[PDB]
């Protein structure tokens, strides 16, 4: 855990300013499980 | 009434619209009336009853106006010309160069993915067309009979449409998967038809050797494979070479890359055509060079990573068997050497000791030979290694005439090989190497020695090669008394140390067990060195045509040099160069005073000597301008006495070059007709562009001349620690150089007007105080006199550069 | 090889020295270390380079881009050689003679002929100042050199070359602008490359009417993205909720040829900023906010949004082709906003807070080359749009568009100024059970300038 602001194009520390580039969104924490569809998927008899 | 109406149109009408030409670009809103004019002109070139004249006008008109059309609005035309094309009749010179310009000049447009501009990208149908038009042409041209005219037009042409070309169209119209693409069918065709002119050249072969002079039957056939086909070949992977070389790691191309089969189906063509003219140069004759330039190209597109790890079984064994071939054809040409057969030779000369030279530079620049030289591979690599040096190092007819062609094969194998044959005692700590893959068993089993001390008997050792070198450097030989020692055995442990600092001792600072070498920056430091010395002693002789070999293969072994060089080799060599220069400068000065005599031998004998002169500074310098773009910032941070003088040398020798006239003709020369590359020295992405034409004039230029790259590169050792006080006195000098002054008229100058160095008390230059603080180097007793020569030389240096290069900019 | 598809030039942020600072002559440096090496450029820009162009892809900007070992300017050629993490890129200009020069870790960059100059023979105009632009997850910093001894690589190349820093003999920090991604509507100038606005005077029988209509539709330079069209002032509801007209009317008129599903016709307040490819309007922002009592009932629920709009593909389905009429009424004493469709009232109505801003908007994606026109009519008992915008035409039954009613566009990316002075915020963690601490104690204020009718 760890406290920050929302928005932030620079970054200053120590006297000295990085500029900062667009961020995606992180720690999104979804997982949504997708599977592979395995429905249509047909057995030949030979490898019964 | 018709032959009236033609008279008026080819000397009123179409030579007006031919002068009228650039006011067809950007007609964007009259695309009707554009496409009626195209298919009326054509039509019209295709006259019944016209003169030769008028139709020349016609077809003049018709290429000057599409020459200035963008490709979205000659879609109309072209679909006409896929028609009328592969019938291949007479009248046919003018679609086929309107194509070739077209697809020429217009290639950004079909090929690239981000287009031309703002021409824009190709639609599916304009691919379509290109592809039908290529395979329409083409398919006519297979079947056509042999005419020189037809084919030399029709060539272009083809090339153009395939460079235009994306390698990865899939055309998705019957009558998906990777076997639709244009690259693909490109190859099975070129593959089919290279193994229909295997068995025909074996049948010619069969032929020749029975004695008989009769016509061959597929003569056809022979002649478009030789005179379109490899050509067309070649240019192909000249245009797309970085397509089939790309991998999903590595995007060297913006097309994309080539699928599995492709890159086999490239191994195999260039083993198949290698197989081609293994020993049948003869037979090819004037189309062996051809040949040789195809498997040049061929050589350069091996992805052997991917054919090896993920290829068919027949392609793996046609790479083993190409190199298990040039082993045993370099084994016979040894044994016929050492026996005292021309073909043989001639095989060696013009088509084996290029391309495996090819073949090592691609492995090693693309580090492919450590995946790939394993094995049996390697143990072919080690036949030809052995046959290789003892070649370079005998004494035939044949060695001194081919030696820089034998020390090149053995140097670029030297770089590409994965195992440490000059270090045969820690080969147990090579992992790479086959023996300690393979079970003794197994060696036994291919019939090579259970030793790796006796896999090269002929070739000595590390130690012995550089105590060799060292002792030859030392006692002043010329290279009459070491030709193979120079042209064989340097630029080999050049390649070799270069090869075998990364996985050494100094490489790697932690241990990671034993190593399976010796090789340290020492060892580097110290043959450059016997390098320098070595040009050292061979200053002003007549013919030395091996420095401008010995220069660019010392190039990889400069990164290491360590800085005690400065003081031992370059200074004194530099100092030598700098009095042949001034002696030959006084001496042109006092011929040119006299205004009488015989002044021609005089002249001849000048020019001779700053030939020289230039030969011997373009051997010295691309070293120097290595080891200063390596040292420059440790000299910066921390100035001596040496880095001085070497700015001082420079800069005089600099100072010789502008004065005199002889000088930069001679040094132009040299350039023009060794044809020196001096951009190589200077430098150290993607082929997006096509530079197909080449001048050897343009090869020479003031801005890449080493001379005054060497002073543009050590001029900040030379303006290092100037305070304002010290740049106003070099303003002055050099606004008193302007006014053409010598040296002592400056120095008087200077010495006039010390009191400018007050100026670094000015506030407004205040924020250049404490810039160079950092330095230790700011502590010593103020001297007038060494200040106004220090600022006199640096302005002479900055006042020079700047009139030299005032020019240039235009 | 599943490729993702390329960051838009919304999401990569300008930085840039503002233009008061521009130099016409002189011999200027400045540095640009990369801490994260990536997709960044850096270079000189002209006033009048757009924060929504990429950098060098037009004549206004002359940049570097050592993800690729690019230089451009009016497109890109191959040049230098690319950088890593760590690196320095020294950035000279020589207007005297007219040069640029980018140097890498103090070392020259070259072109493929050898040359140092990376661009050379151009016009100084205005002149330039410094600019970069960072892509996504980039970091840089650029150092103008208020103290030259804070360089790395000035001394090495430089400094005796006669180059300046760019801040040198300077008191006071330069201001620095950067790009923000918050669209706004902007009036439509009349060299838009999409949309042209034709004003017709009210007749005796016909209301005036501003016509917009579509420049490159039915072409190869077709556009055929979302146009986000508003009124320039906007109409405002009474303070409280309780001279004998309080109502206001305006409509839109789509011509024929242009589909009516592909419009929405209504109303926004100024706290729009919303920009897509792709328009639906299930996705506008609402709230609701439900003030009951202390046993749990709700006694007050007050609906909020900022797009108060209809769709024609509902009208269509409720009711080329012929022209469609559609009327928006406000009850202004009320706050009712309600809709109408050839006469027809449709069953569409909203209410809205007292002092509620609303502009008249139309959001399309065009399907023809003449699209709509705003009708700024009146009815009985319904004030025209001027009348209720302007004071002084209140009392004035008489329609009128004044010069100060326009339409304008949504605009994505501005620039905006970097403050001079940032909130020093303190951020700790005291304990596992105190929890973490946020503390801000020094003030900080700024003079705000106000433009009313935007809010």
């Given at each position: 855990m760890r406290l920050e602001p929302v928005k932030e194009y620079k970054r200053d520390a120590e006297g000295i300013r990085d500029l900062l580039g667009t961020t995606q969104s992180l720690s999104q924490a979804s997982f949504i499980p997708c599977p592979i569809d395995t429905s249509q998927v047909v057995l030949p008899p030979h490898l019964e | 009434a018709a032959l009236a109406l033609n008279r008026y149109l080819c000397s009123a009408v179409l030579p007006l619209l031919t002068r009228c030409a650039p006011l067809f670009a950007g007609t964007e809103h009259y695309t009707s009336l554009i496409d009626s004019t195209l298919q009326t002109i054509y039509r019209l070139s295709k006259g019944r009853s016209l003169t030769k004249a008028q139709r020349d006008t016609i077809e003049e008109c018709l290429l000057a106006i599409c020459n200035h059309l963008r490709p979205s609005m000659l879609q109309q035309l072209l679909r006409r010309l896929v028609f009328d094309v592969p019938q291949l009749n007479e009248y046919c010179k003018m679609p086929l160069k309107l194509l070739t310009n077209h697809y020429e000049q217009c290639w950004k447009y079909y090929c690239l993915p981000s287009g031309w501009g703002s021409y824009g990208l190709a639609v599916e149908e304009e691919l379509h067309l290109t592809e039908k038009l290529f395979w329409g042409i083409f398919d006519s041209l297979s079947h056509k009979k042999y005419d020189p005219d037809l084919f030399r037009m029709a060539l272009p042409c083809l090339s153009a449409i395939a460079g235009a070309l994306p390698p990865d169209y899939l055309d998705t119209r019957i009558s998906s998967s990777m076997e639709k693409r244009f690259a693909y069918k490109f190859l099975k065709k070129i593959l089919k038809y290279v193994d229909s002119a295997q068995e025909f050249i074996a049948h010619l072969e069969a032929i020749v050797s029975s004695g008989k002079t009769e016509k061959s039957p597929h003569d056809q056939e022979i002649k478009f494979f030789a005179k379109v086909l490899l050509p067309l070949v070649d240019q192909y992977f000249t245009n797309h070479h970085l397509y089939f070389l790309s991998s999903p790691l590595k995007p060297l191309s913006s097309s994309g890359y080539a699928s599995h089969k492709e890159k086999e189906m490239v191994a195999s063509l260039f083993c198949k055509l290698a197989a081609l003219v293994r020993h049948r140069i003869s037979l090819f004759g004037s189309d062996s060079t051809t040949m040789v330039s195809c498997l040049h190209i061929l050589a350069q597109t091996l992805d052997t990573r991917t054919v090896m790890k993920s290829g068919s079984e027949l392609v793996k064994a046609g790479l083993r068997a190409f190199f298990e071939n040039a082993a045993e054809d370099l084994e016979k040409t040894s044994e016929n050497l050492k026996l005292g057969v021309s073909q043989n030779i001639n095989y060696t000369t013009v088509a084996l000791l290029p391309i495996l030279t090819s073949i090592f530079e691609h492995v090693a620049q693309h580090q492919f030979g450590v995946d790939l030289l394993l094995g049996d591979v390697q143990i072919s690599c080690y036949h030809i290694l052995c046959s290789l040096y003892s070649l370079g190092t005998g004494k035939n007819i044949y060695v001194e005439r081919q030696r820089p062609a034998l020390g090149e094969c053995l140097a670029s194998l030297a770089a590409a090989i994965p195992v440490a044959f000059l270090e045969p005692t820690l080969n147990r700590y090579n992992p790479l190497s086959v023996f300690n893959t393979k079970t003794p068993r197994e060696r036994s089993i291919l019939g090579m020695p259970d030793t790796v001390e006796e896999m090269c008997p002929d070739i000595p050792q590390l130690e012995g090669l550089m105590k060799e070198i060292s002792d030859l450097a030392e006692s002043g030989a010329r290279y009459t008394e070491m030709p193979h020692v120079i042209e064989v055995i340097l630029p080999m442990l050049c390649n070799y140390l270069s090869y075998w600092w990364e996985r050494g001792p100094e490489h790697l600072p932690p241990s990671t067990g034993p190593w399976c070498t010796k090789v340290t920056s020492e060892h580097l430091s110290v043959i450059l060195g016997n390098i320098l010395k070595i040009i050292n002693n061979n200053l002003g002789i007549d013919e030395a045509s091996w420095m401008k070999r010995i220069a660019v293969y010392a190039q990889p072994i400069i990164s290491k040099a360590r800085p005690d060089l400065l003081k031992s080799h370059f200074i004194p060599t530099l100092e030598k160069l700098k009095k042949k220069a001034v002696k030959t400068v006084q001496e042109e000065e006092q011929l040119k005073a006299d205004t009488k005599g015989d002044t021609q031998e005089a002249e001849l004998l000048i020019l001779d000597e700053f030939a020289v002169l230039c030969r011997d500074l373009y051997a010295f310098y691309p070293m120097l301008i290595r080891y200063v773009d390596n040292n420059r910032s440790n000299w910066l941070k921390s100035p001596s006495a040496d880095s001085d003088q070497l700015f001082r040398m420079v800069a005089e020798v600099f100072i010789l070059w502008c004065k005199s006239h002889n000088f930069k003709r001679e040094e132009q020369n040299f350039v023009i007709q060794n044809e020196i590359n001096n951009l190589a020295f200077l430098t150290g992405g993607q082929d997006?562009?096509?530079?197909?034409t080449k001048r050897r004039g343009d090869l020479y230029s003031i801005q890449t001349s080493l001379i005054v790259a060497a002073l543009k590169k050590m001029l900040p050792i030379g303006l290092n620690m100037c305070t304002p006080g010290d740049q106003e006195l070099i303003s002055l000098a050099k606004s008193r150089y302007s006014y053409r002054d010598t040296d002592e008229e400056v120095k008087e100058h200077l010495r006039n007007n010390l009191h400018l160095q007050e100026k670094s008390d000015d506030p407004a230059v205040k924020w250049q105080l404490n810039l160079y603080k950092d330095v230790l180097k700011s502590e010593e007793p103020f001297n007038a006199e060494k200040t106004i020569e220090r600022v006199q030389r640096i302005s002479a240096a900055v006042f020079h550069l700047e009139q030299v290069e005032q020019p240039l900019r235009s | 090889d599943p490729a993702v598809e390329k960051v838009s030039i919304d999401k990569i942020r300008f930085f840039r020295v503002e233009w008061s600072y521009a130099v016409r002559s002189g011999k200027w440096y400045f540095e640009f270390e990369v801490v994260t090496g990536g997709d960044m450029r850096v270079g000189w820009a002209r006033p009048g380079c757009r924060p929504d162009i990429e950098l060098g892809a037009d004549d206004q900007a002359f940049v570097f881009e050592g993800s690729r070992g690019q230089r451009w300017h009016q497109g890109s050629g191959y040049f230098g050689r690319t950088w890593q993490p760590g690196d320095v890129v020294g950035c000279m200009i020589n207007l005297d003679d007219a040069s640029m020069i980018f140097t890498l870790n103090g070392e020259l960059l070259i072109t493929n002929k050898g040359s140092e100059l990376a661009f050379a023979d151009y016009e100084i105009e205005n002149g330039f100042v410094p600019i970069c632009s960072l892509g996504l997850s980039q970091i840089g910093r650029m150092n103008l050199g208020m103290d030259a001894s804070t360089f790395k690589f000035y001394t090495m190349c430089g400094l005796q070359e006669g180059f300046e820093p760019f801040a040198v003999n300077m008191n006071r920090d330069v201001a620095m602008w950067f790009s923000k991604r918050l669209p706004t509507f902007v009036n439509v100038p009349k060299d838009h490359p999409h949309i042209e606005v034709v004003r017709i005077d009210g007749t005796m029988d016909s209301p005036p009417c501003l016509k917009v209509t579509h420049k490159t539709f039915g072409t190869q330079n077709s556009n055929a993205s979302m146009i986000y069209c508003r009124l320039s002032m906007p109409v405002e509801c009474h303070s409280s909720f309780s001279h004998t007209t309080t109502q206001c009317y305006y409509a839109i008129r789509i011509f024929a040829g242009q589909d009516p599903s592909c419009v929405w016709v209504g109303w926004v307040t100024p706290d729009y900023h919303l920009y897509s490819e792709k328009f639906d309007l299930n996705k506008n922002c609402t709230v609701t906010v439900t003030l009951g009592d202390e046993r749990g009932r709700v006694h007050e629920s007050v609906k909020r949004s900022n797009c108060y709009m209809v769709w024609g593909g509902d009208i269509v389905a409720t009711s080329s082709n012929v022209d469609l009429e559609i009327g928006c009424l406000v009850d202004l004493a009320m706050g009712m906003l309600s809709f109408s469709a050839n006469g027809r009232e449709l069953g569409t109505c909203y209410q809205v807070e007292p002092n509620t801003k609303v502009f008249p908007a139309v959001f399309l994606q065009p399907t023809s080359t003449a699209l709509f026109q705003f009708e700024l009519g009146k009815l009985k008992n319904a004030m025209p749009l001027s009348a209720a915008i302007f004071k002084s035409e209140e009392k004035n039954p008489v329609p009128q568009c004044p010069p100060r009613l326009d339409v304008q566009t949504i605009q994505p990316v501005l620039w905006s100024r970097m403050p001079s002075s940032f909130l020093k915020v303190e951020t700790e963690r005291v304990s596992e059970r105190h929890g973490w601490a946020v503390q801000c104690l020094e003030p900080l204020q700024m003079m705000a300038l106000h433009i009313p009718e935007e809010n």
């Open positions: - | 997006q562009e096509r530079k197909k | -």
